């Protein structure tokens, strides 16, 4: 009885949990109705209990422990009676006020069309459109756009639920697909850019003692790892400013690979440090050789 | 409409796009090619052709299976089908395709008798410059034995042959290092847009299945559940049935079809009545009316008598399927039982019988009902005659037939010559193909009537009915 009333009270709770399903239903009722089909089925794996408890309460009516039994068993039929009553009453009253729901849908679609209009109008002069430099800040605006059409897409899905409820032609929207495709290529590229540069930065701070760049140069090994990152470099989808930025940097990474393999040996003595500071014309090694 | 469309399951039962529908369309295209020239017709997708659009129409119709306004309504071609070359010739067919597009279309393309399909491994897939070279090599290999080709212009082209030359693939053909020169110079071409667009608007078995299975169910459910509001309302509130409310659902669904840009661009009815619900004298509309907001109690032929007939009419915009009926609003029994409480302080029920009142109204009501029945009997016999001979389709013959039938049933009561004139009855018969209205040429297209090239609508309407219980009283109008 505990297990079975727990299932059925979950079902009644879903009938009672949200305010939406209390007022505006959907496909979900079908699944409830499926379980209501099953309700025959569920009671077929309950009927072991009705007769057995009939035998129990024949000569032991109880009154002490019956509390939970009274709660659970009665709760089952509580559901059943409301299932009848509500199902009739709702069905009649919703049949009365159909036109108002259709009008609500009409206003919903009317607003959503213009929302998509202003949406599509936002793109051409904002964000991923190829206008400006925008050095590596683009991910923030791209992610706000991510949440934007995501929200629009959930709105579209609830509209689809309503339309198929009333059996109309499903309004079909072409622009949202264009959004999704363009950004899909964009966001895969930019995520790769973030991964490469953040890994590159993960390494930018180990010391001579920490960073081993001599003959078993662990960093030259990180350079080799970058050799494989370079092995995922090529892609002919399109040329960007960010793309060539990453290309120039990773070239620099390769440059580093054979650069310092022999520049970390005991070969370099503070006079060689001196020569690096002067001939490079760098004050990096003039402050610290 | 809730508990009906919960059970009908319109969306589940769409006809899948079967092979036998695909072969027919392909063979139609080649037959066009035979008439236009010799070698073939070429299909090159968007990116390489600077985003042409008429190929969007063709890839929709040939593969996706859309038709009618659907072909125009879709505006986005999936990226899976983004890059493809197709060439149709009387001998064979040649297709260059990607693996995923191949996966979706495997059954269809392999179904054709002679197919040449190229699709490369994943290893070739990763090297895209490789793919570019493979594309150009394939194009040269396929193209060589040709002189006369068909091509389809685009909206971006704006009807310029030199814009075909502007396209990147043809420019690559015209590259010096290759040395073959410009494609147009080597091979003659011509625009085929008019023929293909002419083809798109005809019918096929696939969309006949859709016409019978999905849209008809939707329309019937709409009509039935729209009229059912009268069945739903209480008895004492039944007099306040404003026509605006009863015609609200029709107007509302009509607007949902109206929002699309394409339907508005494509056209609208040519002064044909819009969907509506009318009662009594209002049913005699002057070719365009508006529904009154007045209640039934405020409408009446005389202060004592009341209206007893109503008319409903609707059509979905997308295909202009029209259905219109007339219904009755009274019990129309000869005599009825009126119950009277006696002494009024207790009240004893005594049944006074044989109320003359409804007999009076019953004379007129029974007349009108018999007329409605007579109209329908006219129609079914008409339809047997139309089947027996195509030439009888002309509206004039149907007109004469209904006239001579209707006169007989009610002839005995009143004088015929004053009562009836052929001008008081009208018929309309129209011919729709995919939202467009054609002409009726039955002799000329008798060869083309072996198939169904279009579908038909017939409407019949009688006006200015005269009573027999009052003086110079017009009862209204009948429609079907």
**Interface contact flag, B5 A102, Cβ < 8 Å:** no
Instruction: Tell me the shortest Cα–Cα distance from B7 to chain A, in angstroms.
Output: 11
A-B contacts at Cβ under 8 angstroms:
59
List the structure tokens of B449. Answer: 């009537």
User: Are B221 and A174 a contacting pair at CB < 8 A?
Assistant: no
CA atoms of B190 and B472, how far apart (whole Å): 69
B264-271: long-range contacts, CB 8 A cutoff, minimum separation 24: B266/B69, B266/B72, B266/B435, B266/B436, B267/B435, B267/B436, B269/B320, B270/B437
Query: Are the Cβ atoms of A95 and B3 closer than 8 angstroms?
Result: yes
CB contact under 8 A, A99 and B218: no
Chain B partners within 8 Å of A93 (Cβ): none
DSSP A26-38: -THHHHHHHHHHH
- Inter-chain touch A99–B128, beta carbons under 8 Å: no
Strand order in the sheet with B149-150: B116-118, B93-96, B85-89, B40-44, B149-150
- Could you give the C-alpha distances from A159 to A173, A221, B32, B155, B320, in angstroms and in order? 12, 54, 43, 32, 25
Task: Give dist(CA B307, CA A244) in Å, integer.
Answer: 82
How buried is A286 (Cβ within 10 angstroms: 0-12 exposed, 13-18 middle, 19+ buried)? middle
With an 8 Å Cβ cutoff, is B75 touching chain A? Answer: yes
User: H/E/C letters for each residue in chain B?
Assistant: CHHHHHHHCCHHHCCCCCHHHHHHHHHHHHHHHHHHCCCEEEEECCCCCCCCCHHHHHHHHHHHCCCCHHHHHCCCCCHHHCCCEEEEECCCEEEECCHHHHHHHHHHHHHCCCCEEECCCHHHHHCHHHHHHHHHHHHHHHHCCCCEEEECCCCCCCCCHHHHHHCHHHHHHCCCCCCCCCHHHHCECCECHHHHHHHHCCCCHHHHHHHHHHHHHHHHHHHHHHHHHHHHCCCHHHHCCCHHHHCHHHHHHHHHHHCCHHHHHHCCCCCCCCCEEEEHHHHCCCCCCCCCCCCHHHCCCCCCCCCCEEEEEEECCCCCCEEEEEEECCCCCCCCCEEEEECCCCCEEEEECCCHHHHHHHHHHHHHHHHHHHHHHHHHHHHHHHHHCHHHHCHHHHHHHHHHHHHHHCCCCCCHHHHCCHHHEEEEEEEEECCEECCCCCCCCCHHHCCCCCEEEEEEEEEEEECCCCCCCEEEEEEC
User: Look-up: residue for tokens 């089909």?
Assistant: A37
CA distance B61 to B74: 11
A 10 A CB-CB count for A98 gives 20
Cβ–Cβ below 8 Å for A166 and B73: no
How far apart CA A37 and CA A42 sit, in angstroms, is 9
Q: What is the C-alpha end-to-end distance of chain B, expressed in Å? A: 24
Residue A8 near residue A79, CB atoms below 8 Å: yes
Task: Output the six-digit token pair for B48.
Answer: 């390489």
Structure token pair of residue B27? 């063979």
Q: In this structure, what DSSP letter does residue A210 have?
A: T
Using the Cα atoms of residue A80, residue A83, residue A89 and residue A91 in order, give the sign of their dihedral.
negative
Task: Please give the method by which this entry was determined.
Answer: cryo-EM
Do the beta carbons of residue B360 and residue B341 sit within 8 Å?
no
Task: Record the tokens describing residue A197, joined without a space.
Answer: 């540069």
What is the C-alpha separation between B446 and B46, in angstroms, rounded? 40
The contacts of residue B183 (CB under 8 Å, 6+ apart) are: B165, B170, B173, B174
Which of A95, A99, A236 minimises the CB distance to B252? Answer: A99
Q: Is B79 on the interface with A (CB under 8 A)?
A: yes
SS3 state of residue A100: helix
- Residue the block writes with tokens 């590229």: A189
- Among the listed residues B297, B359, B370, the one whose alpha carbon sits nearest the alpha carbon of residue B331: B359
Q: Do B1 and A166 meet the contact criterion of CB atoms below 8 Å apart?
A: yes
Nearest C-alpha in B relative to A175: B76
Cα B219–Cα B229–Cα B231 angle in degrees, nearest 5: 115
List Cα–Cα distances, B252 to B269, B289, B326, B463, in angstroms.
17, 18, 21, 29
Nearest residue of chain B to residue A108 (CA atoms) = B256
Distance CA A228, CA B246 (A): 72
| B109 and chain A in contact, CB less than 8 A | no
Nearest-CA residue of chain A relative to B8?
A167
B53 touches chain A (CB under 8 A): no
Q: What is the rounded CA–CA span in Å between residue A42 and residue B98?
A: 50
| Residue B408 contacts residue B373 (beta carbons within 8 Å) | no
The C-alpha angle with vertex B136 and arms to B132 and B141, in degrees rounded to 5, equals 145
B114: left (phi over 0), alpha (psi -120 to 50) or beta: beta
Q: Do A102 and B253 touch (CB under 8 A)?
A: yes
The tokens for B254 are: 């009509």
- Report the residue of A29, A111, A169 to disrupt the B interface, i.e. the one with the largest count of B CBs within 10 Å: A169
B424 near B465, Cβ under 8 Å? Answer: no
Question: Using CA of residue B72, residue B75, residue B79, residue B83, what is the dihedral sign?
Answer: positive
Whether residues A99 and B259 touch (CB distance < 8 A) is answered with: no
Whether residues A98 and B5 touch (CB distance < 8 A) is answered with no
Interstrand relation of B93-96 and B116-118 (parallel, antiparallel or unpaired): parallel
Phi-psi region of A281 (alpha: psi -120 to 50; beta: other; left: phi over 0): left
Cβ–Cβ below 8 Å for B3 and A109? no
Which positions ≥6 away from B80 have C-beta within 8 Å? B98, B100, B101, B104
Distance from CA of A278 to the nearest CA of B (A): 45
The residues on A that touch B, with CB distances below 8 Å, are 30, 91, 94-96, 98-99, 102-103, 105-106, 109-110, 113, 164-169, 171-172, 174, 177-178, 181, 235-236
Minimal Cβ distance to B129: which of A103, A177, A236 = A236
Cβ proximity of B230 and B241 under 8 Å: yes
Report the C-alpha gap between B357 and A130 in whole angstroms: 83
Q: Are B275 and B291 in contact (CB under 8 A)?
A: no
Which one of B73, B74, B252 has the shortest CB-CB distance to A102?
B252
Q: B255 touching A, CB under 8 A? A: yes
| Gap from A282 CA to chain B (nearest CA, Å) | 42
Is the distance from CB of A189 to CB of A136 less than 8 angstroms?
Answer: no
What are the structure tokens assigned to B283, written together? 């049913």
Question: Among B462, B365, B456, B366, which residue's Cα sits nearest to residue B405?
Answer: B462
Q: Which of A186, A180, A182 minimizes the C-alpha distance to A241?
A: A186
- Count Cα neighbours of A183 within 13 Å in the Cβ-side half-sphere: 21
Collapsed DSSP state (helix, strand, coil) of residue A17: coil
Say if residues A121 and A107 touch (Cβ distance below 8 Å). Answer: no
Q: Chain A closest CA to B215's CA: distance in Å?
A: 9
For chain A, say whether B128 makes contact (Cβ under 8 Å).
yes
Q: What is the DSSP letter of A261?
A: S
Query: B260 is written with which tokens?
Result: 């699309």
d(CA B216, CA B8): 12
Contact of B218 with chain A, judged by CB distance below 8 Å, is answered with yes
Long-range contacts of A37-46 (CB under 8 A, 24+ apart): A39/A80, A39/A83, A42/A4, A42/A7, A42/A8, A46/A4, A46/A76
Distance CA A130, CA A138 (A): 11
Instruction: Say whether A160 sits in a helix, a strand or coil.
Output: helix
Contact B47, B83 (CB under 8 A): yes
Cβ distance B253 to A172 less than 8 Å, yes or no, reads no
A172/B2 Cβ within 8 A = no
DSSP reduced 3-state for A71: helix
Inter-chain contact B249–A102, Cβ cutoff 8 Å?
A: yes
Q: Which residues in chain B are contacts of A235 at CB distance < 8 A?
A: 128
């Amino acid at each position: 009885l505990d297990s079975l009333t727990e299932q059925t009270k979950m079902l009644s709770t879903k009938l009672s949990k949200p305010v939406k399903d209390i007022d505006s239903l959907g496909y979900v009722m079908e699944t409830l109705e499926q379980i209501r089909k099953e309700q025959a089925e569920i009671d077929m794996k309950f009927n072991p209990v009705q007769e057995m408890y009939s035998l129990l309460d024949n000569y032991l009516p109880g009154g002490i422990t019956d509390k939970d039994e009274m709660d659970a068993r009665s709760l089952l039929r509580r559901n059943w009676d409301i299932l009848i009553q509500q199902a009739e009453i709702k069905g009649k009253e919703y049949q009365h006020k159909q036109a108002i729901y259709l009008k609500e849908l009409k206003q919903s679609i009317k607003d959503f069309t213009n929302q998509v209009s202003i949406f599509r109008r936002d793109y051409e002069k904002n964000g991923p459109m190829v206008e400006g430099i925008s050095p590596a800040e683009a991910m923030e605006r791209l992610r706000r756009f991510e949440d934007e059409y995501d929200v629009k897409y959930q709105m579209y899905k609830i509209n689809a639920r309503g339309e198929n409820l009333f059996g109309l032609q499903n309004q079909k929207y072409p622009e949202l697909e264009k959004t999704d495709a363009e950004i899909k290529n964009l966001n895969k590229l930019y995520n790769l850019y973030d991964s490469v540069i953040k890994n590159i930065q993960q390494f930018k701070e180990k010391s001579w003692q920490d960073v081993s760049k001599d003959d078993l140069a662990k960093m030259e090994e990180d350079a080799g790892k970058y050799g494989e990152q370079c092995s995922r470099l090529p892609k002919d989808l399109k040329e960007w400013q960010a793309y060539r930025d990453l290309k120039n940097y990773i070239d620099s990474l390769r440059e580093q690979l054979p650069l310092i393999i022999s520049l970390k040996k005991p070969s370099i003595m503070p006079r060689h440090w001196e020569k690096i500071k002067e001939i490079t014309n760098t004050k990096l090694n003039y402050e610290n050789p | 409409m809730f508990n009906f469309f919960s059970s009908a399951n319109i969306n589940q039962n769409i006809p899948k796009y079967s092979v036998n529908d695909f072969v027919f369309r392909l063979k139609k295209i080649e037959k066009i090619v035979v008439k236009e020239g010799l070698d073939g017709f070429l299909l090159i997708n968007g990116v390489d052709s600077r985003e042409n659009t008429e190929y969007v129409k063709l890839t929709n119709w040939l593969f996706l299976g859309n038709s009618g306004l659907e072909i125009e309504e879709n505006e986005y071609l999936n990226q899976i089908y983004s890059d493809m070359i197709v060439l149709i010739k009387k001998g064979t067919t040649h297709i260059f395709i990607d693996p995923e597009a191949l996966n979706s279309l495997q059954t269809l393309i392999y179904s054709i008798p002679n197919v040449d399909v190229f699709c490369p491994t994943e290893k070739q897939y990763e090297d895209k410059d490789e793919m570019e070279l493979l594309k150009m090599a394939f194009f040269l290999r396929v193209m060589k034995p040709t002189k006369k080709v068909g091509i389809l212009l685009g909206q971006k082209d704006k009807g310029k042959i030199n814009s075909i030359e502007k396209w990147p693939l043809i420019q690559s053909y015209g590259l010096e290092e290759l040395g073959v020169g410009f494609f147009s110079m080597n091979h003659e071409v011509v625009d085929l847009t008019l023929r293909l667009n002419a083809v798109y608007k005809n019918y096929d078995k696939f969309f006949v299945s859709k016409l019978i299975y999905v849209v008809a169910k939707r329309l019937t459910g709409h009509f039935n559940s729209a009229a059912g509001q009268l069945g739903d309302m209480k008895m004492h509130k039944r007099n306040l049935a404003t026509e605006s409310q009863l015609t609200e659902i029709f107007r509302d669904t009509y607007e949902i079809e109206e929002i699309s840009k394409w339907v508005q661009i494509r056209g609208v009815n040519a002064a044909l009545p819009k969907p509506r619900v009318l009662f009594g004298k209002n049913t005699s509309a002057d070719c365009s009316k508006e529904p009154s907001v007045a209640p039934l109690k405020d409408l009446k032929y005389s202060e004592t008598f009341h209206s007893f007939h109503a008319t409903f009419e609707t059509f979905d915009l997308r295909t202009c399927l029209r259905a219109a009926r007339t219904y009755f609003l009274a019990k129309g029994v000869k005599e009825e039982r009126n119950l009277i409480t006696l002494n009024d302080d207790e009240g004893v029920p005594q049944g006074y019988e044989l109320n003359i009142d409804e007999n009076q109204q019953y004379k007129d009501q029974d007349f009108l009902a018999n007329l409605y029945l007579s109209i329908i009997i006219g129609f079914n016999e008409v339809m047997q005659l139309i089947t027996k001979d195509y030439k009888n389709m002309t509206e004039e013959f149907i007109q004469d037939y209904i006239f001579q039938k209707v006169s007989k049933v009610y002839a005995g009561f009143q004088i015929p010559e004053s009562e009836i004139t052929l001008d008081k009855i009208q018929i309309i018969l129209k011919a729709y193909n995919s939202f467009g209205e054609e002409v009726k040429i039955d002799f000329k297209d008798t060869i083309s009537f072996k198939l169904t090239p279009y579908f038909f609508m017939v409407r019949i309407e009688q006006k200015n009915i005269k009573s027999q219980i009052l003086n110079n009283t017009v009862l209204g109008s009948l429609v079907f």
